[PDB]
Amino acid sequence: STGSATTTPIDSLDDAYITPVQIGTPAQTLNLDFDTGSSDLWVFSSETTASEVDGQTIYTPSKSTTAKLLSGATWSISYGDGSSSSGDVYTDTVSVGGLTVTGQAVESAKKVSSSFTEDSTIDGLLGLAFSTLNTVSPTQQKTFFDNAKASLDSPVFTADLGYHAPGTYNFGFIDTTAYTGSITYTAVSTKQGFWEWTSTGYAVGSGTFKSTSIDGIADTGTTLLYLPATVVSAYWAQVSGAKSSSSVGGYVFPCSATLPSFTFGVGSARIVIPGDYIDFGPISTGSSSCFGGIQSSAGIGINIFGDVALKAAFVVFNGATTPTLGFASK
Numbered sequence: 001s002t003g004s005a006t007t008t009p010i011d012s013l014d015d016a017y018i019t020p021v022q023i024g025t026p027a028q029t030l031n032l033d034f035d036t037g038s039s040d041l042w043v044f045s046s047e048t049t050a051s052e053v054d055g056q057t058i059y060t061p062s063k064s065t066t067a068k069l070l071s072g073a074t075w076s077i078s079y080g081d082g083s084s085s086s087g088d089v090y091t092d093t094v095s096v097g098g099l100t101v102t103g104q105a106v107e108s109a110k111k112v113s114s115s116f117t118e119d120s121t122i123d124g125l126l127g128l129a130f131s132t133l134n135t136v137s138p139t140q141q142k143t144f145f146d147n148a149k150a151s152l153d154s155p156v157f158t159a160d161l162g163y164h165a166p167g168t169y170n171f172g173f174i175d176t177t178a179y180t181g182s183i184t185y186t187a188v189s190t191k192q193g194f195w196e197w198t199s200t201g202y203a204v205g206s207g208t209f210k211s212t213s214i215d216g217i218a219d220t221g222t223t224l225l226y227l228p229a230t231v232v233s234a235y236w237a238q239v240s241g242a243k244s245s246s247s248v249g250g251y252v253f254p255c256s257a258t259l260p261s262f263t264f265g266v267g268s269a270r271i272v273i274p275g276d277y278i279d280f281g282p283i284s285t286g287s288s289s290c291f292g293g294i295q296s297s298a299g300i301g302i303n304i305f306g307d308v309a310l311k312a313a314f315v316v317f318n319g320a321t322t323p324t325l326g327f328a329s330k
Helices: 144-151 229-236
Strands: 003-009 017-023 028-035 041-043 068-078 084-096 099-112 124-127 156-160 167-171 184-187 196-204 210-218 225-227 243-245 250-254 262-266 269-273 279-282 289-292 294-296 303-305 314-318 324-328
Touching: 003 084, 028 041, 041 084, 068 099, 099 144, 184 196, 196 229, 210 225, 229 250, 229 294, 250 294
Parallel strands: 028 124, 041 099, 210 303, 225 294
Antiparallel strands: 003 017, 003 167, 017 028, 017 084, 041 124, 068 084, 084 099, 156 167, 156 314, 184 324, 196 210, 196 262, 225 303, 243 250, 250 289, 262 269, 279 289, 314 324
C-alpha cells in the first residue's frame, strides 16, 4: 500500500504545517501537525477541557463505531518549546492520504497548554519519530508509521515541505519526479528515539565550505534551524546590524536586510537554504526588527534540523531494519 497527503503552512511564515487525517467511522477529519521529533498521535477531543478549546476541530470517540477505549492507558507529553498535553487513549481507524491503519492508538487530550489552545489551526499532532519515545502508560504504543510499515510497498515516508506553499507527505514510495539530481543517504542513530544524523559541514552565502561534523535531528515539528553557537555566529556576522537579543530570545536582524543563503552538508552532497527562507518577519507587528530562522542550540542540548532546513530538500525517512535518512535538492 501507499498514501499521499498534501501538507499546508498554517500561516504566512510557515510556522508549522497541517495535514488532513481521517479518524474513526464515519471519518472525522482533523488537521494534524506531522512531527518527526515526537511519537504520540494526539488530538483535541470531546474530552478536552472546554476552556482550553478555541476553534479546533475535535475528535468525538462516542460518534465512531470503531473507537474502543484502551482501558487504563494514559499519556502525558512535554515538548521542547515548553508546551504540553495529556489525557487518555482510544484505538480507532486512522487514514492518511488513502493509507489506512486499524487499531491505531489515538491519544485523546483532556488538557492542553496555552500555546495549543491559542493555535486554532492545529487539531493535534501525529508523531513520526521512533516508537520508543511514545508516552502511553502502562503499555507503550506504536506510531502510525510503525503500524503501517509492514503493509507499505517500501518501508519509507518522505517529507516535501513547501516554502510559503503546500507540499506533500508520502508513505510507502519515493516520488522520483519530486526532486532533482540524486538522493544522498546518511546514517541514523536511533539511540535517543529521533531521526538523528551527522551533517558534514556548512557554508554561509558564497563562502567556502567548512568541513565539520554536526550531529542533529531531522524534526518536521520544529520551525527553525538550531545549530551550534559558533556556526550561528558565523552566519549572522554576514548580516549588517544582526545581533543576539536576550530580550527577544535569539538573533534578530534589520527587516531591510537581504539575507545570505546557508548550505549544509549531507555526505559529499550539499543542500542550499535560500536566504529568504531564514526571514521570520517582524518580532512584533510593525517592527523593523526581524526574527532570524537560524538560532543557537546552545540552550537545547541537541541540534535541530527543523522546517527551515528540511523545506529546502526532499527528505526520505527510511524505516528499513537499519534506518537511514536521504536528502535531495528540489
